[PDB]
């Protein structure tokens, strides 16, 4: 029971982290397509 509850909440936290990283990806792609940031920043956002 303790594992079920704790891993449910932890999965929620990790899902929030994944969503934040996806938003950072979207912003980095938008910047790169505009010619402001280099390809390295976009690729690093992908990796992260």
């Amino acid at each position: 029971l303790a594992a079920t509850d704790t891993l449910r909440r932890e999965e929620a936290a990790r899902q929030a982290l994944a969503g934040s990283s996806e938003a950072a990806m979207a912003l980095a792609k938008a910047r790169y397509e505009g010619g402001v940031d280099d390809y390295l920043r976009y690729l690093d956002a992908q990796r992260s």
């Binding site: 303790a2 704790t6 891993l7 932890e10 936290a13 990790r14 929030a16 950072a24």
Partner: protein
């Protein structure tokens, strides 16, 4: 530690509301807060 993370997140959110921070900084602050939350959940599971 999580209290500290939330304080930093609040400060970064207030700073972006004033335009002094990019959305990238807000996203990284959110990511750090979520990362700390997962650690708190893991510690809760261990204690229980």
């Amino acid at each position: 530690t999580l209290d500290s993370r939330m304080a930093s997140l609040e400060l970064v959110s207030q700073r972006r509301a004033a335009g002094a921070a990019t959305a990238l900084d807000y996203q990284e602050a959110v990511g750090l807060a979520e990362q700390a939350r997962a650690e708190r959940e893991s510690t809760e599971r261990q204690l229980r």
